Each structure stands twice: as C-alpha cells, then as structure tokens.
C-alpha cells in the first residue's frame, strides 16, 4: 500500500511526455523525455 | 473589558483560564485547519449572513 504522506513521483519514459496542472498555483507544465516528475500538494497528472 | 448579562464571547489561544463565578463555560471550541484552496461555510447568526 502507498504511504499517502510521501511525495508522489513518476519516472517518465524516454520519448514520452506527462502533463501536470497545479490546481493551487494555477501553473500548467508538460515534462518531456526521461525525468522524475514529482507532484506538489495540489498538482494532478492528466490521465 | 466589560460584558452584559447574556453576552457570549470567545477566548482563544495560549492561556490559562479559571471561570469567574459570574461566567458559564458554554463549550470547548477548536480551530478548523484549511489549505489555501480549502474552505468552510459559516453563518453569522447575529446578522444571519
């Protein structure tokens, strides 16, 4: 079971992109390539 | 500070309290924690708003 208190992170694959929206800072971001994407308290992944 | 009979007031925060013989403790009351997007609805019963 996932420890809900730990920062949620996703390892983005090579030649892929992830879209995240910060529902509190109101800032949109798309992360390309191999990178570790971590979500702030109110950020959410686009599914 | 002065209060009329039947007045309510709130005391808060880091303190010691012993109720004066003229005072009734009505309830224990506690803060509600809320992040920058979270909220509550409150009714001000004196005005109704």
Q: What is the resolution of this structure in A?
A: 3.1
DSSP-based three-state secondary structure for A20: strand
Q: Which two tokens stand for residue B15?
A: 């303190």
Closest-CA distance of chain B to residue A3, Å = 20
Distance CA B37, CA A42 (A): 9
Q: Which two tokens stand for residue B48?
A: 């109704």
Q: How far is CA B9 from the centre of its chain?
A: 6
Query: What are the beta bridge partners of residue A21?
Result: A28, A44
Query: What are the beta bridge partners of residue A38?
Result: A9
Residue of A nearest to B37 (CA): A24
Mutate: best of B36, B38, B39, partner A, most A CBs <10 A: B36
């Amino acid at each position: 079971p996932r420890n809900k208190t730990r920062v949620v992170s996703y390892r983005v694959p090579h030649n892929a992109a992830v879209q995240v929206y910060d529902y509190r800072e109101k800032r949109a971001r798309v992360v390309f390539g191999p990178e570790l994407v971590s979500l702030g308290p109110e950020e959410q992944f686009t599914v | 500070v002065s209060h009329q009979a039947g007045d309510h007031w709130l005391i808060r925060g880091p303190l010691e309290y012993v109720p004066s013989a003229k005072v009734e403790v009505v309830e224990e009351r506690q803060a509600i924690p809320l992040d920058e997007n979270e909220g509550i609805y409150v009714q001000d019963v004196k005005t109704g708003k």
